Amino acid sequence: GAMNSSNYAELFNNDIKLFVDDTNVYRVTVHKTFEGNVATKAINGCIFTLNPKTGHLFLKIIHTSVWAGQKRLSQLAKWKTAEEVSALVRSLPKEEQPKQIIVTRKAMLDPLEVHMLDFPNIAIRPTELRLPFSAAMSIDKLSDVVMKATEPQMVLFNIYDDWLDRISSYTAFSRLTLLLRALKTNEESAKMILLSDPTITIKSYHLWPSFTDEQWITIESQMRDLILTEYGRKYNV
Amino acid sequence: MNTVPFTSAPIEVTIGIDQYSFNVKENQPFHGIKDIPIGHVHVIHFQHADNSSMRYGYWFDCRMGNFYIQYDPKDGLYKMMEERDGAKFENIVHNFKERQMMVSYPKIDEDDTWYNLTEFVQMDKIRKIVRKDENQFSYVDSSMTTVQENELSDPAHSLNYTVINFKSREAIRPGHEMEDFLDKSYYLNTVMLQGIFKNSSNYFGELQFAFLNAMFFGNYGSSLQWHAMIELICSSATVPKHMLDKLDEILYYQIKTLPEQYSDILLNERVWNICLYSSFQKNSLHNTEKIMENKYPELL
């Protein structure tokens, strides 16, 4: 059934599962034509497929050439997502294939279900959580590899860097979603917080700075403060 | 013209024959139904005055034999049977008529309703859906479940309608996932029409039989099946013109005949709104759309 606050710890048990987020698959800019009409131009996008227990991220880059000569692109994007997720499962050895795939947007259920008909024992689930994975393109190294791509490309990352050496999956996922929530609510401030101190660098093979444990506490508190402030502003509370 | 005599009527019951129906009182001298039009299937059905649950009845075709009804006090219901002794049967029928203890099938000459509801229904196809090959007639009731319902328990008593499932390998060609799911033409025309039903008349006949079972017995699985077969056509971009025009006539007479008070459970809002207004064939059901709007605008 649907994933919600009640059954939240199931994310960190030992049944393999993947989140799939399609928000950044079909990305456009909107502009004016010479004659004054509106047109779109696609830019490269990505499927965000994440194992929340291990941090393994399967970033499938969606090159603008996919769309060439196609109609109803926002609908096509959901089917291309499901095609690529299915191909990913097929490419994994049996013992690495997920037992569940949780889609962050309910419109992906039918396309993934149809593409996964060969895997009847893989459960396709929606979620009631309002996960912030659209902000994935606020992470500088993910945005960089998506925008440079010249062809379809799968790039693998651990979205938790090395955190799991010191914290549990539950805590790691809570840190990730806090960071992404903040980047979503106010990217400029969130990014200021993360980089303010030049003495804290990002390892070449990491996505986030190499904070000590104490420094992660200050960071996390600063991200909480940002999120609550923006909320009072949105609603005038 | 043909006759189905009744041995007796020991319990108060509402008896239906096709779209007609009569009240019969406990031990009222009722001995059958005469003047039944040859050339069509027919259904006789029952609802006891004491158990307004379990409507039940028998599909039959008088060309296939001499049939009669007899109450069974052990099993508590009116049973259809076959008389193999032709002389013995004309004898019962002629004496009951002489004594005028039979209702006449009350057809108005102007009326093609029953023909229109049963145009493609064949008794031979019914007996493949209701398998009981030692009788020529077929029992159906309110509670019988379909084969597809069973998959999600007793197979002897199942409605073996053709299984339709839009998210199955049967429906979806590998490599045409999106195309086939959004345009079911290949499932309709290759898999179902050319593959399983062989022709459109058998498809329409199962669709009509499913509707009639849902209407006369409130059989829920039959209602599911009727809607599924409509939806498969309406969700197909490429349908023979002859099928669309005939579908419009079929559905018109079905909507026309439905009891007004039952539109809530018998009519699936989503399917109808999709078929009449969102589907490929939104513009091909003019009579069905006109009657739905003027009779059940609430559902839409």
PDB file of C-alpha atoms in Angstrom, chain A residues 75 79 110 113-115 117-118, chain B residues 167-169 172 177-178 181-182:
ATOM      1  CA  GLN A  75       3.186  12.114 -20.903  1.00  0.00           C
ATOM      2  CA  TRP A  79       6.822   6.150 -19.905  1.00  0.00           C
ATOM      3  CA  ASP A 110       0.565   2.778 -14.355  1.00  0.00           C
ATOM      4  CA  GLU A 113       3.442  -1.246 -13.575  1.00  0.00           C
ATOM      5  CA  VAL A 114       3.084  -1.853 -17.314  1.00  0.00           C
ATOM      6  CA  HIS A 115       6.860  -1.745 -17.842  1.00  0.00           C
ATOM      7  CA  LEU A 117       4.904  -6.802 -16.021  1.00  0.00           C
ATOM      8  CA  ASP A 118       7.867  -9.180 -16.362  1.00  0.00           C
TER       9      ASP A 118
ATOM     10  CA  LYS B 167      -2.331  -4.378 -17.261  1.00  0.00           C
ATOM     11  CA  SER B 168      -1.393  -7.906 -18.330  1.00  0.00           C
ATOM     12  CA  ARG B 169       1.137  -9.369 -20.709  1.00  0.00           C
ATOM     13  CA  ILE B 172       0.669  -5.323 -23.727  1.00  0.00           C
ATOM     14  CA  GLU B 177       4.207  -0.757 -23.538  1.00  0.00           C
ATOM     15  CA  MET B 178       3.064   2.846 -23.899  1.00  0.00           C
ATOM     16  CA  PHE B 181      -1.691   0.764 -22.971  1.00  0.00           C
ATOM     17  CA  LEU B 182      -2.925   4.052 -24.426  1.00  0.00           C
TER      18      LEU B 182
END
